[PDB]
């Protein structure tokens, strides 16, 4: 099948765009189960509009086409980044051209990287250190929880108090492409994902879990795979169990 974008309302004023691929994006171990992947981006429309996590260059064209069909790019206020990677730069560059008014919202360690990627541009950047919130209006107050780790110094979770959705980007996902938007049995895929991408940073995973533990969450709006709804509590417990196990191995 060809790559496409799946768009669906998920909450009040909230939609997901899942850019889908039935084959690996890279020749790397995280795709080695050969089940494809999705890259998930989100749109919250309050008084102000924010997008969360625009995908890599590979999905850029179909992403922007779908986004243009969903929102008026001249009405776009914020682009929130769950982390920073150079393979997203071309997507940011296209967004900037189409919506020159946008403000980038990121964890502090990403701010420098952004400005360097657009050196002869004057970027609007709003770094979030964890104290300040961002009000989109209509109740959509965003809380920011930086989860810096050696792998993702600018790792950031975002929580919408109105919908109780936590945007977790790399945390809690799975590399699997299917028709189902929401999470059942891709437990194997979530576990493999943890082992590929989370396990080497187990003490930081634990720190992240502690940070989010006081939140009332109805959905993990993850960066890859099905959105974690009903399996949220069980997956969170699994991440905790898998993390303490890894710590045993790490020591030897």
Q: Does 92 bind Cl ion (CB under 5 A)?
A: no
Asked if residue 13 lies in contact with residue 70, where contact means CB atoms within 8 angstroms, the answer is no
Q: Does 156 bind Cl ion (CB under 5 A)?
A: no
Question: Segment near Cl ion (CB under 5 A), from 60-68, 126-134, 152-160, 240-248?
Answer: 152-160
Tokens coding 152: 């993702």
> Based on CB atoms, which residue is closest to Cl ion, 110 or 136?
110
Q: Does 104 bind Cl ion (CB under 5 A)?
A: no
Q: Does 208 bind Cl ion (CB under 5 A)?
A: no
Asked if residue 181 lies in contact with residue 8, where contact means CB atoms within 8 angstroms, the answer is yes
Q: Does 201 bind Cl ion (CB under 5 A)?
A: no
Q: Does 154 bind Cl ion (CB under 5 A)?
A: yes
Nearest-angstrom CA–CA distance, 132 and 126? 11
Question: Segment near Cl ion (CB under 5 A), from 71-79, 154-162, 163-171, 244-252?
Answer: 154-162
CB of 169 to Cl ion, least distance (A): 9
Q: Does 102 bind Cl ion (CB under 5 A)?
A: no
CB of 32 to Cl ion, least distance (A): 23
Asked if residue 153 lies in contact with residue 138, where contact means CB atoms within 8 angstroms, the answer is no
Question: Segment near Cl ion (CB under 5 A), from 21-29, 55-63, 80-88, 206-214?
Answer: 80-88
Question: Segment near Cl ion (CB under 5 A), from 55-63, 149-157, 160-168, 178-186?
Answer: 149-157
First to last CA, the chain: 44
Where do contacts with Cl ion occur on this chain (CB under 5 A)? 83-84, 152, 154
């Amino acid at each position: 099948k060809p790559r496409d974008v799946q768009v669906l309302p998920i909450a009040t004023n909230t939609k997901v765009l899942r850019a889908r691929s039935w084959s690996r994006l890279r020749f790397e171990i995280e795709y080695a189960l050969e089940r494809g992947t999705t890259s998930n981006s989100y749109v919250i429309e309050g008084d102000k509009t924010a997008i969360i996590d625009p995908p890599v260059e590979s999905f850029m064209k179909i992403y922007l086409e779908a986004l243009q069909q969903t929102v008026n790019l001249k009405k776009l206020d914020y682009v929130i980044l769950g982390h920073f990677s150079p393979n997203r730069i071309p997507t940011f560059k296209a967004l900037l051209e189409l919506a020159p008014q946008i403000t980038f919202v990121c964890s502090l360690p990403a701010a420098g990287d952004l400005r360097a990627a657009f050196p002869d541009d004057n970027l609007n950047i709003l770094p979030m250190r964890g104290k300040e919130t961002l009000d989109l209006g209509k109740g959509h107050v965003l809380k920011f929880l930086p989860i810096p780790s050696p792998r993702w110094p600018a790792g950031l979770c975002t929580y919408d108090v109105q919908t109780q959705i936590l945007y977790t980007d790399k945390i809690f996902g799975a590399h699997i492409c299917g028709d189902d938007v929401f999470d059942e049995s891709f437990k194997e895929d979530q576990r493999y994902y943890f082992n590929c991408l989370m396990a080497p940073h187990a003490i930081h995973v634990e720190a992240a879990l502690e940070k989010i533990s006081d939140l009332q969450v109805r959905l993990y709006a993850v960066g890859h795979g099905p959105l974690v709804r009903t399996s949220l509590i069980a997956l969170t417990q699994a991440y905790a169990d898998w993390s303490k196990a890894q710590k045993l191995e790490h020591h030897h």
